[PDB]
Design a protein around this ligand. Structure first.
Ligand SMILES: [Mg+2]
Length: 302
């Protein structure tokens, strides 16, 4: 579906966008989405606090609006995200280990159940590693109380619920080979060696002046692909403007299309207007939904 989505599909990939339910009724937002993209990711609507703010009480309406729209347009859906340290409801962190484990598996199971057979890929675990040089696990209720094994447990639970979804580990600042991506690499290699059910590694790819597109972006994607997983660019945006921004997008698209198991790219929003990094004007469409030089470069590269 869509101009970018169909261009990508011709070479066996998808092209998606992060979507917000609260903008779906806006004519130009919906028109741009439907004209351009072949996959969607709910920006906020499937996060823990959005779907289970009260324990064992699930609120799917907002995410259902995005999924229903996608299905009506023949678009793929990425589920985002099941287990994540960030933006948890207040009551998750005080739970003792045994009850946290139960609550985590219950959350995975009921969320995946509601969307069974409708989800192309799940971000099962998100952002489990620290930034910087340590390669260490990030502190979280899951890491602190369940230990290193919580990631494997989450993937095992996920696999029992919906065998048809690709199960992804997702993270940022993992674009080049560095201490952080090395820690993820070690984990995924170990998972694949032992037959842990992981199908994919997501690379958020939030690029800016301090975190530029690295010279080894392609080689890094390739080494992950070579472990026997798909790689997905999940949250792509690139701060800047004009030819410099366009050339950065070319670099990224070229790298994905050069890696046979890079199965798709999702940009983190439809329009600059609603970007989480709006002052960096980092997307393919401006505030009036007009195609930017960045868009032209992406389309020409596909
Ligand atoms: Mg072409």
């Amino acid at each position: 579906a869509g101009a970018l989505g169909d261009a990508a599909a011709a070479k066996g990939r998808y092209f998606g966008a992060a979507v917000a339910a609260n903008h779906l009724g806006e004519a130009a937002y919906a028109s741009t989405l439907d004209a351009q993209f072949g996959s969607v990711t709910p920006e906020n609507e499937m996060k823990w606090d959005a779907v289970e703010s009260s324990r064992n009480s699930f609120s799917f309406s907002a995410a259902d609006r995005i999924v229903s729209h996608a299905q009506s347009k023949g678009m793929k859906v990425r589920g985002h995200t099941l287990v994540w340290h960030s933006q948890l409801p207040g009551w998750v962190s005080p739970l003792a280990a045994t009850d946290l484990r139960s609550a985590m598996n219950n959350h995975i199971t009921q969320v995946m159940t509601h969307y069974k057979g409708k989800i192309h890929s799940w971000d099962v675990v998100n952002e489990a590693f620290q930034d910087g040089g340590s390669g260490a696990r990030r502190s979280s209720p899951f890491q602190d109380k369940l230990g290193n094994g919580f990631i494997e447990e989450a993937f095992r639970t996920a696999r029992t619920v919906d065998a048809d979804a690709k199960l992804c580990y997702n993270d940022y600042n993992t674009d080049g080979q560095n201490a952080k991506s090395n820690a993820v690499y070690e984990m995924v290699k170990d998972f694949k060696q032992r037959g842990v059910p992981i199908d994919c590694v997501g690379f958020q790819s939030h690029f800016n002046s301090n975190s530029p597109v690295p010279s080894d972006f392609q080689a890094n994607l390739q080494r992950f692909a070579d472990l026997g997983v798909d790689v997905q660019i999940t949250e792509l945006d690139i701060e800047g403007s004009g030819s410099a921004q366009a050339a950065n997008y070319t670099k990224v698209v070229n790298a994905c299309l050069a890696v046979t198991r890079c199965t798709g790219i999702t940009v983190w929003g439809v329009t600059d207007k609603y970007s989480w990094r709006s002052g960096g004007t980092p997307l393919l469409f401006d505030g009036d939904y007009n195609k930017k030089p960045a868009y032209d470069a992406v389309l020409a590269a596909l």
